[PDB]
Design a protein around this ligand. Sequence first.
Ligand code: ZN
Ligand code: ZN
Lengths: 96, 237, 84, 81, 89
Amino acid sequence: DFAFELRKVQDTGKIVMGAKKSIHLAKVGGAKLIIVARNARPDIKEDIYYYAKLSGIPVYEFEGTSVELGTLLGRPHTVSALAVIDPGESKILALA
Amino acid sequence: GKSLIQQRRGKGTTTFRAPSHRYRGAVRYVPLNLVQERTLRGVVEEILHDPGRTAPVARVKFEDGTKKLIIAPEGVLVGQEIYIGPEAPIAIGNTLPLAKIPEGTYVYDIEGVPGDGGKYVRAGGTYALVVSREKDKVIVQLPSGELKAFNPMCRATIGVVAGGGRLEKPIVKAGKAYYIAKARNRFWPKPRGVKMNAVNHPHGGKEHHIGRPSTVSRRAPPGRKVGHIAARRTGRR
Amino acid sequence: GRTTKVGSAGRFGPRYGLKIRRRVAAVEARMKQKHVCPVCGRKAVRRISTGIWQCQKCGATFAGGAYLPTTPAGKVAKRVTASK
Amino acid sequence: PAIEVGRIAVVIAGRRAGQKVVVADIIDKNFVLVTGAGLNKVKRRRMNVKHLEPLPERVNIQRGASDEEIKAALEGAGISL
Amino acid sequence: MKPMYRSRSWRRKYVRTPGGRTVIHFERRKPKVAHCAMCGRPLNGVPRGRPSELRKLPKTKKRPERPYPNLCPSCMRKVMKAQVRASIT
RNA sequence: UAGGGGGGCCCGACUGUUUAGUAAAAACACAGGUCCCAGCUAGCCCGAAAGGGUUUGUACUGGGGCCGACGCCUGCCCAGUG
RNA sequence: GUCGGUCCUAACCCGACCCGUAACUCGGCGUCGGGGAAAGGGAAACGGGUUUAUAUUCCCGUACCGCGGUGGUAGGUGCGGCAACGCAAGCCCGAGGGGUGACGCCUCGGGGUAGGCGGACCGGUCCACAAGGCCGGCUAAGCGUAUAAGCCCGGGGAGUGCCG
Ligand SMILES: [Zn+2]
Ligand SMILES: [Zn+2]
């Protein structure tokens, strides 16, 4: 994911990070895009892909890692999954 | 005269036997009247320490429900899937015939003649290099220097043997060596013939010196082959 | 620590000599410093037995060297077999 | 959505694990109403969205539905719980 | 102490008697509790005790009622999910 | 109940073992240094043979000899015997 | 019947077959069969009394295991909890899986018990009075009952950080 559009979303729009909330949204509804790292837990990746296909939601796979996602964001922790509800002034949805 | 440790080892007493009841089983591949071309698939489930191998072992469960021990390569994870057969991929932990293995690849656990079960490069840290592939023989460089020739239907495993770098840290004390040699009952401690008596050794005497050349012939009878046996040379260089 | 030159080898006392104590301390330092996992990228790999390493944070158990999880020859093999 | 009225589902936690089932209503961001409709030993009750694996079979129902009605549609969908 | 009772597999204890004797009693040790197959984590609902202590119990007080009681619930839900995701074809 | 202490020299680095019943040591062992044989139906060994030990092992290994922690060093001769 | 042997295997050993030996009461690999621990693994009982001399063995009292039965119910044809889990939750035969049995050296904390100390009081004894000291003040297995620690479930939604 372009650091550019990601930062633009983070500060302009609203994101909700975390695998639990990402799966909840992929299952119920309320998300527009879901990003996941390549080295994330396969249980999580399986659940996300399945639920999002059954809901009709787009998934983007980020070829870095949880740590690189966390550091792209301003976060000293891991981010294995991320949900984007609504972007503001960002072209993030051009990546699916 | 009296005997040597050389000579008493050959009888098979508890002072000299191996305590194999303490070890994990033998490590062979599979019999190949079963592996025609089927390219078995299996899963690693455990990695363990063997007191008779100078290398870790790994337990594998196959689609047959059968369970085997392999020698663990460097970087194999609990949970992986290894293949064993002619058409398997080329990666770490996969066993193939040497013909199908390129030149430049690192290799371990090679069969001598097809069907043996694994004779070469099974010590910890070791590897071999593939040099050439003919239609009647494959040349391989062994960890000693020899360029040996194998029949191209012999089996090998790709990668390197784990356990490497074992002799960097010193043994500092004598009790640690006691324990290392009690694991596999090696003769420890060791005497010196030069300080033995003349019944007990070709050297031996009141003076603590050798009075004949230490170089012995390859045709000297047993009880006498002590020192440098058929030495081409001696010294430092 | 509290001492300047000796490390893990300050337990042996005045015994066994320089080269011995230096090698021991260097090796154990490099082994007891934490290491990066190949599955989660976090620095929590610790030794379990001789040849066996484990991550305390993800549960990845793998095989490697005796005092480090990698060897130069292993690195070469990885690179070569990735090339081919 | 992976969870909605008319969604078929399998229970995967508890004493009723691995039973087919229908989602008949919605209560909260975590809880739904689940029923078996007379075709198994699963009553109309509350359940958590974690304890349910959805399936790609669906049924046509109204939001808030009685078992006789939930059941009567299934025979048109041809799906057997 | 008899030689067999001096063996450290007997968990001694000193006990006072109504008529004032202060006897020594001996008991065998309990096993440890059962552990999951896929993770090595204790199981809940399964009690500890020797076959004597266990054969004086009914079935339903020896294990939980959910399926796969040899597994922790995190692994149970995993196997069930796998089953259902494969039963699509 | 409850250490006498200090300054020099020789030998062995240390903890350890030894002549049951005149020798506990400066002798043995030790860690470490170096050399020789062996790619395995090997090398070395028992045995009358069959068969066996090292071997549920494979050169980061098995076996066979000398010096004996650490520190600075280890010079010339292959005519003789091997 | 309840303590121990008797059962299981360990390091190890024997027999038969097989190969050798001029031969064997000798030597040995493999297959098969069998042994091998009165401190390893392992169904089940505790108190009082009785005899010149035995007692977890005899007597009293209160209990527990294993085989076989009779008679009723649970169940076959039942439930409560989102869940972790709670339940009397069918019978006979065979197979397979999973757990327990089932494990080293060093070190620390927490909860408990045997055992001991002190003060009061009730009886007895020592002590010229007095003050004071000493002795006794007991409660087994079994059956029924619960919280620690550890591990888990649900809600909740965190970083110049907070919890321990
Ligand atoms: Zn990891
Ligand atoms: Zn688990």
